Design an enzyme around this catalytic site. Sequence first.
Site, mmCIF file in Angstrom:
data_model
loop_
_atom_site.group_PDB
_atom_site.id
_atom_site.type_symbol
_atom_site.label_atom_id
_atom_site.label_comp_id
_atom_site.label_asym_id
_atom_site.label_seq_id
_atom_site.Cartn_x
_atom_site.Cartn_y
_atom_site.Cartn_z
ATOM 1 N N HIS A 57 81.835 138.743 -31.886
ATOM 2 C CA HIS A 57 82.767 139.478 -31.006
ATOM 3 C C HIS A 57 82.282 140.863 -30.554
ATOM 4 C CE1 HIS A 57 84.948 136.206 -32.874
ATOM 5 N NE2 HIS A 57 85.904 136.309 -31.968
ATOM 6 N N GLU A 109 96.108 133.517 -29.493
ATOM 7 C CA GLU A 109 95.371 133.144 -30.698
ATOM 8 C C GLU A 109 96.212 132.378 -31.716
ATOM 9 O OE1 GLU A 109 92.262 133.460 -30.627
ATOM 10 O OE2 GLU A 109 92.172 134.741 -28.838
ATOM 11 N N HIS A 160 79.582 129.359 -30.150
ATOM 12 C CA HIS A 160 80.879 129.888 -30.579
ATOM 13 C C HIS A 160 82.020 129.256 -29.779
ATOM 14 C CE1 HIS A 160 83.030 133.009 -32.922
ATOM 15 N NE2 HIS A 160 83.919 132.888 -31.953
ATOM 16 N N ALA A 161 83.008 128.725 -30.499
ATOM 17 C CA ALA A 161 84.139 127.990 -29.916
ATOM 18 C C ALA A 161 84.914 128.826 -28.914
ATOM 19 C CB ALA A 161 85.081 127.512 -31.028
ATOM 20 N N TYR A 172 93.288 138.865 -33.536
ATOM 21 C CA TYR A 172 93.200 137.986 -34.710
ATOM 22 C C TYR A 172 94.043 138.453 -35.898
ATOM 23 C CZ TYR A 172 89.423 136.147 -31.839
ATOM 24 O OH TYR A 172 88.670 135.673 -30.794
ATOM 25 N N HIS A 221 93.023 125.397 -33.073
ATOM 26 C CA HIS A 221 93.083 126.756 -32.531
ATOM 27 C C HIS A 221 92.745 126.769 -31.045
ATOM 28 C CE1 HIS A 221 92.461 131.191 -32.472
ATOM 29 N NE2 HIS A 221 91.470 130.883 -31.650
ATOM 30 N N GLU A 222 91.636 126.113 -30.697
ATOM 31 C CA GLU A 222 91.169 126.019 -29.315
ATOM 32 C C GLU A 222 92.103 125.192 -28.444
ATOM 33 O OE1 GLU A 222 88.894 127.919 -28.188
ATOM 34 O OE2 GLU A 222 88.145 128.659 -30.113
ATOM 35 N N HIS A 277 94.936 127.341 -27.208
ATOM 36 C CA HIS A 277 94.587 128.089 -25.978
ATOM 37 C C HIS A 277 94.800 127.220 -24.734
ATOM 38 C CE1 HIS A 277 93.155 131.665 -27.896
ATOM 39 N NE2 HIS A 277 92.053 131.133 -28.393
HETATM 40 ZN ZN LIG Z 1 91.074 132.003 -29.974
#
Ligand SMILES: [Zn+2]
Length: 583
Positions: A473, A372, A314-315, A483, A344-345, A348
């Site tokens: 999650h 996020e 999971h990323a 999210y 997305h990553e 962060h």
């Molecule tokens: Zn995220």
Amino acid sequence: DEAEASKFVEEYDRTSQVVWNEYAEANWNYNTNITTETSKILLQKNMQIAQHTLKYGTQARKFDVNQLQNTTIKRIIKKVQDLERAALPAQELEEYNKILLDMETTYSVATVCHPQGSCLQLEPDLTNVMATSRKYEDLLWAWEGWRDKAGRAILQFYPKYVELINQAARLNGYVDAGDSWRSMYETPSLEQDLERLFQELQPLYLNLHAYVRRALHRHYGAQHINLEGPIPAHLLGNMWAQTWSNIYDLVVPFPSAPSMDTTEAMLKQGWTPRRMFKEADDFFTSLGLLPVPPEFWQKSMLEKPTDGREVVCHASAWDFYNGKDFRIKQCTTVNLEDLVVAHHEMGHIQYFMQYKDLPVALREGANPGFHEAIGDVLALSVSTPKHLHSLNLLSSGGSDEHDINFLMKMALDKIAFIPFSYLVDQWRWRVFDGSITKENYNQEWWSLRLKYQGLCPPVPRTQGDFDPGAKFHIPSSVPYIRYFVSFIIQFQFHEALCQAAGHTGPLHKCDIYQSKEAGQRLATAMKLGFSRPWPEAMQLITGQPQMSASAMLSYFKPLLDWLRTENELHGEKLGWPQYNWTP
Ligand SMILES: [Zn+2]
Ligand SMILES: *[C@@H]1O[C@H](CO[C@@H]2O[C@@H](C)[C@@H](O)[C@@H](O)[C@@H]2O)[C@@H](O[C@@H]2O[C@H](CO)[C@@H](O[C@@H]3O[C@H](CO)[C@@H](O)[C@H](O[C@@H]4O[C@H](CO)[C@@H](O)[C@H](O)[C@@H]4O)[C@@H]3O)[C@H](O)[C@H]2NC(C)=O)[C@H](O)[C@H]1NC(C)=O
Ligand SMILES: *[C@@H]1O[C@H](CO)[C@@H](O)[C@H](O)[C@H]1NC(C)=O
Ligand SMILES: [Cl-]
Ligand SMILES: [Cl-]
């Protein structure tokens, strides 16, 4: 008071930098190399960080925070008073740490096997079946099999997890873990605010739902789809039916306007995981934002290892609390979906880099939703047909038919996600507050799956099933409401940034690539970290302080008009009044 407070914060910050760095290292080593040894070392580093947290937390609680002059200092000390899991007595703490480790490992190693045949991992194998199979029974095998193996295996741990996380929350002055988590937003009106935003997206979701239900009726048959009922949960191209973009082929508004196989385009042109992240890095720098350090490329895990290592696929993005070492861990697949995830990553990471000079206590997003949203904002521009064409992954633009097709593709991801992302923590908050018992975990999950998403399970659930456990999650104990917040506010950021970049015309046609004005708005907000209440960062980006569904609504307005016309002509009943129906 004031001199002691300042010194305390300085001492906290320099000691935390060292302890958190050491912990992050051990955590990383486990996540990228699941063994007995790395487990042992991680569980040990848990006790080290808890020692440090107890020391400074006990000290922080001796200060009268509301009697302190400086805002920045008062805010740091308030936070340090929250020990989180380190509030647990030693025995409960070790048990809790072990439960968390056991749940994550169970989820990350679960496989689904044919008897005398092959075994499939979630990534990439089961994900691919869910995305590409158009056979009802094959989709059901993967959907059920995954729940049978991952979900059921989590059930043994969950009630004790709930007991211990709630106990920790109470020892930190909260009523339960849900209370503790919601407090991350510093927003007394949170539950009502979120409900209002959800209600605003209802016309769009219901219309999308009815349109997709009709297309599924076409493909899978009248005997398997109730045009006035919920949709079987295995037919939406995704394990959790949380995003529906993988069934675009079944629902194309204008099939006469064909679009390129983007995956085949990426594969043909020789795109790799490294290229995907380099392109993301280029988008950030085009905005005048920071590049990722050379160290990032050396230390990150940007693809599933092939050396026999078991990993958490999971990323995720990692801040090692030294202002230098930032990493991504992702079992990247070469496709458009994972290109968006890469962005997305990288959002962060950008946030980590932007607030790296703040005291570590303030090295968080304005709220968890902001963290996020950043990467998703850039990914919205990346996703435009114009931009994909510039990456040579699409051929075109600019017909109305291609336009409604594009909006449909985006809606399948962004609109479908709204009720799912709202639904996850509605379930958890009610688990945490004791209104859902272990007897009713699964039944109440499905009640909400029905109420919010209008989905039904394709096969009736039985005792021992724990479908929430089949979602990352949940065993991983990562809060989910971030999210939902992200999806609302990312459209607000898109709108504001597009205005700042001088875009005119329909919002969905905006591409902020190379906009220094857009980059500057993002940077100023991200630099604040957790130093101010989040409406200040909202204000900096958008020129106003509130969460609002209006930007997302405006983005999708031409599609809402199209869906209303299309659904009306086919006489669709919006919603699922036949809510008891199952297949
Ligand atoms: Zn995220
Ligand atoms: C409340 O307290 C905060 C925090 O204070 C800090 O931590 C304490 C524990 C203690 O160690 C204390 O000594 C320390 O300051 C205060 O916030 C700081 O405010 C100052 C001044 O506004 C900031 O100083 C900047 O420092 C950065 C680098 O660290 C520089 O980028 C910047 O440098 C210059 O800025 C001037 C602008 O006048 C320009 O002329 C120059 O070109 C150059 O850019 C500043 O000097 C500091 O960053 C803040 N620290 C933190 C951690 O937030 C705050 O001021 C206090 N408030 C009150 C009401 O007193
Ligand atoms: C994986 O972890 C083990 C601990 O059992 C360690 O010996 C080994 O070096 C690690 N492998 C890699 C690729 O780092
Ligand atoms: Cl489910
Ligand atoms: Cl959250």
